[PDB]
Design a protein around this motif. Structure first.
Motif, PDB file in Angstrom:
ATOM      1  N   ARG A   7       6.193  11.565   7.553  1.00 45.06           N
ATOM      2  CA  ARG A   7       6.524  10.325   7.891  1.00 45.06           C
ATOM      3  C   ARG A   7       7.853   9.760   8.365  1.00 45.06           C
ATOM      4  O   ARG A   7       8.670  10.642   7.851  1.00 45.06           O
ATOM      5  N   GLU A   8       7.947   9.058   9.319  1.00 44.74           N
ATOM      6  CA  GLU A   8       9.424   8.636   9.902  1.00 44.74           C
ATOM      7  C   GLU A   8       9.380   6.911  10.115  1.00 44.74           C
ATOM      8  O   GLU A   8       8.388   6.460  10.458  1.00 44.74           O
ATOM      9  N   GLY A   9      10.603   6.506   9.729  1.00 43.26           N
ATOM     10  CA  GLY A   9      10.700   5.084   9.957  1.00 43.26           C
ATOM     11  C   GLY A   9      12.005   4.337   9.464  1.00 43.26           C
ATOM     12  O   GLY A   9      12.696   5.014   8.644  1.00 43.26           O
ATOM     13  N   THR A  29       9.865  14.819   4.587  1.00 44.78           N
ATOM     14  CA  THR A  29       9.690  16.345   5.039  1.00 44.78           C
ATOM     15  C   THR A  29      10.135  17.217   4.151  1.00 44.78           C
ATOM     16  O   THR A  29      11.242  16.813   3.382  1.00 44.78           O
ATOM     17  N   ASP A  30       9.154  18.234   3.701  1.00 42.32           N
ATOM     18  CA  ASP A  30       9.733  19.367   2.725  1.00 42.32           C
ATOM     19  C   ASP A  30       9.859  18.724   1.347  1.00 42.32           C
ATOM     20  O   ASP A  30      10.935  19.232   0.581  1.00 42.32           O
ATOM     21  N   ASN A  31       9.226  17.530   1.104  1.00 42.75           N
ATOM     22  CA  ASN A  31       9.191  16.903  -0.243  1.00 42.75           C
ATOM     23  C   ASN A  31      10.431  16.368  -0.470  1.00 42.75           C
ATOM     24  O   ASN A  31      11.121  16.137  -1.623  1.00 42.75           O
ATOM     25  N   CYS A  32      11.229  15.824   0.522  1.00 42.65           N
ATOM     26  CA  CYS A  32      12.469  15.343   0.714  1.00 42.65           C
ATOM     27  C   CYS A  32      12.769  14.051   1.509  1.00 42.65           C
ATOM     28  O   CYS A  32      12.034  14.075   2.671  1.00 42.65           O
ATOM     29  N   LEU A  33      13.430  13.127   1.197  1.00 40.64           N
ATOM     30  CA  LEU A  33      13.489  12.071   2.007  1.00 40.64           C
ATOM     31  C   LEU A  33      15.133  12.090   2.684  1.00 40.64           C
ATOM     32  O   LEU A  33      15.844  12.312   2.161  1.00 40.64           O
ATOM     33  N   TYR A  34      15.105  12.425   3.805  1.00 36.03           N
ATOM     34  CA  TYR A  34      16.210  12.316   4.756  1.00 36.03           C
ATOM     35  C   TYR A  34      16.388  11.126   5.360  1.00 36.03           C
ATOM     36  O   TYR A  34      15.526  10.373   5.833  1.00 36.03           O
ATOM     37  N   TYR A  35      17.679  10.432   5.372  1.00 29.46           N
ATOM     38  CA  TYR A  35      17.973   9.430   6.207  1.00 29.46           C
ATOM     39  C   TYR A  35      19.399   9.477   7.077  1.00 29.46           C
ATOM     40  O   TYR A  35      20.110  10.417   6.721  1.00 29.46           O
ATOM     41  N   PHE A  36      19.187   8.878   8.254  1.00 32.77           N
ATOM     42  CA  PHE A  36      20.135   8.664   9.092  1.00 32.77           C
ATOM     43  C   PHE A  36      20.571   7.428   9.449  1.00 32.77           C
ATOM     44  O   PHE A  36      20.077   6.605   9.162  1.00 32.77           O
ATOM     45  N   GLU A  37      21.967   7.375   9.867  1.00 32.86           N
ATOM     46  CA  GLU A  37      22.650   6.088  10.359  1.00 32.86           C
ATOM     47  C   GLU A  37      21.780   5.470  11.788  1.00 32.86           C
ATOM     48  O   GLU A  37      21.392   4.501  11.498  1.00 32.86           O
ATOM     49  N   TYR A  38      21.675   6.508  12.389  1.00 29.54           N
ATOM     50  CA  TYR A  38      20.806   6.223  13.950  1.00 29.54           C
ATOM     51  C   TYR A  38      20.168   6.961  14.182  1.00 29.54           C
ATOM     52  O   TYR A  38      20.083   8.520  13.580  1.00 29.54           O
ATOM     53  N   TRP A 111       4.513   3.842   3.125  1.00 29.63           N
ATOM     54  CA  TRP A 111       5.506   4.733   2.905  1.00 29.63           C
ATOM     55  C   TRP A 111       5.459   5.391   1.227  1.00 29.63           C
ATOM     56  O   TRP A 111       5.390   6.415   0.790  1.00 29.63           O
ATOM     57  N   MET A 112       4.944   4.328   0.503  1.00 30.91           N
ATOM     58  CA  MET A 112       4.648   4.525  -1.058  1.00 30.91           C
ATOM     59  C   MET A 112       3.560   5.850  -1.341  1.00 30.91           C
ATOM     60  O   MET A 112       3.482   6.591  -1.968  1.00 30.91           O
ATOM     61  N   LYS A 113       2.422   5.392  -0.267  1.00 27.53           N
ATOM     62  CA  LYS A 113       1.490   6.316  -0.211  1.00 27.53           C
ATOM     63  C   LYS A 113       1.906   7.856   0.070  1.00 27.53           C
ATOM     64  O   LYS A 113       1.438   9.028  -0.179  1.00 27.53           O
ATOM     65  N   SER A 114       2.697   7.863   1.205  1.00 27.87           N
ATOM     66  CA  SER A 114       3.063   9.396   1.899  1.00 27.87           C
ATOM     67  C   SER A 114       4.060   9.835   0.789  1.00 27.87           C
ATOM     68  O   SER A 114       3.816  11.214   0.685  1.00 27.87           O
ATOM     69  N   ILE A 115       5.046   9.223   0.166  1.00 33.73           N
ATOM     70  CA  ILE A 115       5.900   9.743  -0.851  1.00 33.73           C
ATOM     71  C   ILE A 115       5.272  10.153  -2.149  1.00 33.73           C
ATOM     72  O   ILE A 115       5.221  11.547  -2.328  1.00 33.73           O
ATOM     73  N   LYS A 116       4.063   9.394  -2.699  1.00 34.68           N
ATOM     74  CA  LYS A 116       3.263   9.775  -3.709  1.00 34.68           C
ATOM     75  C   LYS A 116       2.463  11.125  -3.451  1.00 34.68           C
ATOM     76  O   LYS A 116       2.395  12.132  -4.122  1.00 34.68           O
TER      77      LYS A 116
END
Ligand code: 4IP
Length: 127
Positions: A7-9, A29-38, A111-116
């Motif tokens: 998931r991305e968003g 992805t890869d059981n991690c949440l990556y976050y970007f400024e842009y 999001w909650m579903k994807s993460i779980k």
């Protein structure tokens, strides 16, 4: 790493020591949440491994559609994570919880579903 994302968003995240809300582009992805400024940024602002974490809905005074990532096994325990600083530093996060706000009620549910699902899918879950 970012190919084949679950998931991305866009999501709003509350800061660690400094409690400020920031809009970040997230990639699960890869059981991690990556976050970007842009969105087109080459380098992530931070990474939050999801192993050992749980998710729970929460109500916020100002932000709608919120939930929190937290470590159930050890209350008040800092969540293992890594992020960058403007000066060039790569340091560990200071969060005991990650309060996130989604763009809509539906996106919160997704999001909650994807993460779980990601956390449960992990072959090393609860080990
Ligand atoms: O910009 P200010 O008002 O100083 O607030 C920052 C941002 O919210 C950072 O978010 P981002 O990294 O997305 O920019 C956050 O890092 P996290 O990513 O760890 O939440 C910092 O947490 P601390 O370093 O714990 O204060 C917090 O101080």
């Amino acid at each position: 790493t970012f190919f084949n994302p679950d998931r991305e968003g866009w999501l709003l995240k509350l800061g660690g020591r400094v409690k400020t809300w920031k809009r970040r582009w997230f990639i699960l992805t890869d059981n991690c949440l990556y976050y970007f400024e842009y969105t087109t940024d080459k380098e992530p602002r931070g990474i939050i491994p999801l192993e050992n974490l749980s998710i729970r809905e929460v109500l916020d005074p100002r932000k709608p559609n919120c939930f929190e990532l937290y470590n159930p096994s050890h209350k008040g325990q800092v969540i293992k994570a890594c992020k960058t600083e403007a000066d060039g530093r790569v340091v560990e996060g200071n969060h005991v919880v990650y309060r996130i706000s989604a763009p809509s009620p539906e996106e919160k549910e997704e999001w909650m579903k994807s993460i779980k699902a990601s956390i449960s899918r992990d072959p090393f879950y609860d080990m």
